[PDB]
Amino acid sequence: EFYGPDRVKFLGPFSTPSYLKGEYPGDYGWDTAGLSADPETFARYRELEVIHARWAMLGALGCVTPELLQRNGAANFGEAVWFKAGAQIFQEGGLDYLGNPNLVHAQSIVAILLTQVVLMGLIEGYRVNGGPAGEVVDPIYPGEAFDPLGLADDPDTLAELKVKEIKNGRLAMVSMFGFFIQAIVTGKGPVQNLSDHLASPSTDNFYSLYAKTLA
Amino acid sequence: EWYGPNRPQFLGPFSNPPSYLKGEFPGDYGWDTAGLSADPETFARYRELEVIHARWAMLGALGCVTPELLQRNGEAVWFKAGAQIFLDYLGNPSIVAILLTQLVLMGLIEGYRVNDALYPGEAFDDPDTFAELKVKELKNGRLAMVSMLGFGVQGLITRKGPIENLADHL
């Protein structure tokens, strides 16, 4: 499964474009609007999908972890909630990593922005061209210096890991979209919503307190 | 007169159709300024999406028009329809149950539909009048899309029923 012509499709037994031939990882044969009818556009879309998957996985982990730490009494952050965490730079003492005044103590947003722009641009350019960490051969799966533990050694294991990565990234993207729209609707933390729903699932949900107020 | 070079375009006397819009499919009015349907497969997918959107916009326009008009002739507003369930039909005597039932039935019917797909006929129903009715369906669908867009934008900006806004014009 997951490869060739007999892989699982996106509709199970109820299921296809000719260009989805079951070769690339994470191919469930879901292209209804036909945006990937061009091989070059298909390659570009695959690359953007992989990059977005990795970024969304990182973002979901970084949105969950600080609030989980704060609510368990493991640390005292300036602003545990993910969408309120960007205003810590405007507080009295600035931004302190994990609440320790001796860890980062960032104070200026201009310096943060300049350093981030420079470093991100440099590493981005290295990714698309090749630099200190290696030379580009596979635009999205470099390996070598980015696979120190050698988990993607066997080609079969490499394909399995690619499928697992793309699926966990798709789930992360969906959950990130959920985080955004919940924050824009409820206005509270994600784990806070989870705890509230777990306290009273029957009465605490989107419909009972927000469906009627939306319109 | 809707097929071939003598077709009516979206600009009238100005006849500059694209190369790929060679008046074969219904409603080929030669409107592609962004070149979004150069690829034939993309054109086929766009045609299917447009037809499905047309039918759904037809149904939505009718289902939004009926309640308030029935109210005047004896919440009624189109967007304040799902709030009543917190729902007796025509005023004549659990969200999860309806949600799962609708989801499973819709999944079943659409999986059956996926597995001429665009124009099946038979169980749901001279080729000249057939093509005439296809063109008429496409025009009524485009009108339905425009009407639904206008209805939604008015609900956002006026917070009142569309027929109420029409009566206030008048």
Binding site: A133, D147, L149, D153 | -
Partner: protein
């Protein structure tokens, strides 16, 4: 032969040793920007 990668190691994953550093000294990592 499992649980790791087989993989001279310099101070950068992709860099060249300088001409004057031939790698004979003990701690020679080819580091002299």
């Amino acid at each position: 032969g499992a649980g790791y990668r087989q993989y001279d190691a310099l101070w950068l994953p992709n860099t060249e040793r300088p001409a004057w550093l031939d790698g004979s000294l003990p701690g020679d990592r080819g580091f002299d920007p």
